[PDB]
Design a protein around this ligand. Structure first.
Ligand code: MG
Ligand code: MG
Ligand code: MG
Ligand code: MG
Ligand code: MG
Ligand code: MG
Ligand code: MG
Ligand code: MG
Ligand code: MG
Ligand code: MG
Ligand code: MG
Ligand code: MG
Ligand code: MG
Ligand code: MG
Ligand code: MG
Lengths: 129, 88, 6
RNA sequence: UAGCUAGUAGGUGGGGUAACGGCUCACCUAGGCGACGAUCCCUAGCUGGUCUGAGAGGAUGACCAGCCACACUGGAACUGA
RNA sequence: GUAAAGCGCACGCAGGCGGUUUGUUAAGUCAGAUGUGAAAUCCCCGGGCUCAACCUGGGAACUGCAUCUGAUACUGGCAAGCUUGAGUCUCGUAGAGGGGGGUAGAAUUCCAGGUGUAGCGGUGAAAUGCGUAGAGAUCUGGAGGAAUACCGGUGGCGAAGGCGGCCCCCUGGACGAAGACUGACGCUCAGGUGCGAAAGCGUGGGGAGCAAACAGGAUUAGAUACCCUGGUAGUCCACGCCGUAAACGAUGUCGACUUGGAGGUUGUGCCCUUGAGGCGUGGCUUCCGGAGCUAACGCGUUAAGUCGACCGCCUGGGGAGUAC
RNA sequence: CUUACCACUUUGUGAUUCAUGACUGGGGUGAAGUCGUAACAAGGUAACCGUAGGGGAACCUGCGGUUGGAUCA
């Protein structure tokens, strides 16, 4: 059954990005937005949009550059089937730096750079580049 | 299968109104009905396994509702089992 | 198994 | 190897030891353990560490040091801090 | 998928995992602080033996455990919900889905009766066999078992195995359409339970056709076979046992997502239903093919693409799915 | 002197494990052995799977399944 949206979001992005799709919809959530935010804020998509009342609908605008898309690779790290909690020294560095790692902290859902500067740790959600 | 009255009747017996057709209690009953009826159906036959496959689903499904109820409304469950005279 | 022996 | 368990599990009260304790004894409750592997078999002294490995791992417990056990074999107390 | 590897298939307990909103919690998670983590070792920088090995000063390290105090996004717990997941109801829709019970229509075989006259049958050729005590050919009615031509599909239903004449009785599931209702009740499943071709096993029936075994005739160097003439168990029914098949898509289940094109099938909605029909919208199902995947052949919105959850299984050939 | 505990040790009957055993079962390995030629081509009767019966031997036959069957049948 449908036991992991967070993942599902990521892959809807990846599957869309692949097919040169201009937009991407999905039944929404707070955390999807929390994520979707880091994507604009860190420069991977142009912006989100929530046409919703009882059954929200988060909508993303895919970025592209040349004939190739902006989300080079997007990977679900932690899963319900296997949870991943890092500290701060153990925070990952995607692409030797040139890439972000969405991590959920007790002061909010930020990037590895952010979590680093803020000097805190938490469940790493996913790698992106 | 299940008589339109017999269905309607029971919906208007265990259900908190007619039209409250999706109620847990109702289903449990609507099921217990069928299960009990078919009971005579496979009283002879015994070989209508395909149907029995259907029976078992009803029985299964019921056990999963009775269980839901026990988790939610301890009172309604306990009252319900004595009400259908089953579960033991 | 087995001509000239062998 | 899927069951194990009578001082067995707990309580009370005596006794007991440097000391807590079924450590022991009488009585009373009927418990206690187990698929998060009891029970039963097989092998083994443990660690610091050593060797290998990019690491994660695998392999290992000589020499040094810490800890435990044993002193022909089985058993037992005495002396005494 | 074909290299070793998806359990034949479903139901389901324990376990794992879990949509969406708020509050709270603070177990997991995160942050900081204090004890601690023997020395030697390793590592860094030095120092001492002519150098090195060796010896040595100080540090770093010991990725750990514990505690107190904090942080509250995610996870978990508790409280109250929400309706898209899931589920009940309403009307229908299609269907070899199942069990039980009648009957119809060809055909084979057998019996009875008629004429008839010497052939039928079979093969590569022959023969055994059936007719000279009269078959086959052939004439009529009747008995019995088994299976349902044509429709018939590239179809349909079922979890799988599987299920085709017609008719009646009880019964499963699916799907479309409008809504109504419960409100995360869900996904998966070690063990467990059940179903599970054909052959086989027990008791009793039934037995036309076909046919292991067996017999006879041929073939061949041989022929324990292929072929021919016969034919018993069996195939059919009742009940019980058996649990295996190349039980195959050699492809586990569930959910989401990713260009197209030609059909089949069963629905529903709209068009003076105008009449061959058209244009939407579902479920299911053949064919070709993009990307992507792939060792390749090929798979390709019914994935073998892109992701997640849970289970099953594989680890060189043989020995062996054997021995204990 | 006596009582309780208790070691060596005694008896009966099981479990288990190691070695060994006339004889026997298949297995593996050995340039050219004997018998036949089952499979690979439509392998000269398409093959294979489960099962059953038979046969010096591979195998042969019945029932159902599979295409991992060649062919304008
Ligand atoms: Mg006391
Ligand atoms: Mg005392
Ligand atoms: Mg390794
Ligand atoms: Mg001694
Ligand atoms: Mg294979
Ligand atoms: Mg399968
Ligand atoms: Mg909470
Ligand atoms: Mg140290
Ligand atoms: Mg029989
Ligand atoms: Mg098998
Ligand atoms: Mg094709
Ligand atoms: Mg065996
Ligand atoms: Mg041959
Ligand atoms: Mg052949
Ligand atoms: Mg056959």
């Amino acid at each position: 059954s449908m036991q992991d949206p967070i993942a599902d979001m990521l892959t809807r992005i990846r599957n869309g990005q692949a097919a040169n799709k201009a937009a991407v919809t999905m039944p929404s959530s707070k955390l999807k937005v929390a994520i979707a935010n880091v994507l604009k804020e860190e420069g991977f998509i142009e912006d989100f949009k929530v046409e919703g009342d009882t059954k929200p609908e988060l909508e993303l605008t895919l970025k592209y550059f040349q004939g190739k898309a902006v989300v080079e690779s997007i990977q679900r790290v932690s899963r319900p089937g296997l949870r991943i909690y890092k500290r701060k020294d153990e925070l990952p560095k995607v692409m030797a730096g040139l890439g972000i790692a969405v991590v959920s902290t007790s002061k909010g859902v930020m990037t590895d750079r952010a979590a680093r500067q803020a000097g805190l740790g938490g469940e790493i959600i996913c790698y992106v580049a | 299968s299940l008589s339109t009255e017999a269905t309607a009747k029971i919906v208007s017996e265990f259900g908190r109104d007619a039209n409250d057709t999706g109620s847990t209690e109702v289903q449990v009953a609507l099921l217990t009905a069928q299960i009990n009826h078919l009971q005579g159906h496979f009283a002879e036959h015994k070989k209508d396994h395909h149907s029995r496959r259907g029976l078992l689903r009803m029985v299964s499904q019921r056990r999963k509702l009775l269980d839901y109820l026990k988790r939610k409304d301890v009172a309604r469950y306990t009252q319900l089992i004595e009400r259908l005279g089953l579960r033991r | 198994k087995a001509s000239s022996x062998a």
